[PDB]
């Protein structure tokens, strides 16, 4: 679901972080 920035999966793909992938 990698074009989905609204998720872990999609934020890993783009290699970023946020509320949706917290570090």
Interface with RNA (CB under 7 A): 1-23
At closest approach, how far in Å is the CB of 10 from RNA? 6
Which residue from 1, 3, 7 is spatially nearest to 20, judged by alpha carbons?
7
At closest approach, how far in Å is the CB of 5 from RNA? 5
| Cβ 11 vs Cβ 20: under 8 Å | yes
At closest approach, how far in Å is the CB of 21 from RNA? 7
| Cβ 7 vs Cβ 13: under 8 Å | no
């Amino acid at each position: 679901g990698k074009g989905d920035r609204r998720t872990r999966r999609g934020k890993i793909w783009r290699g970023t972080y946020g509320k949706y992938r917290p570090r």
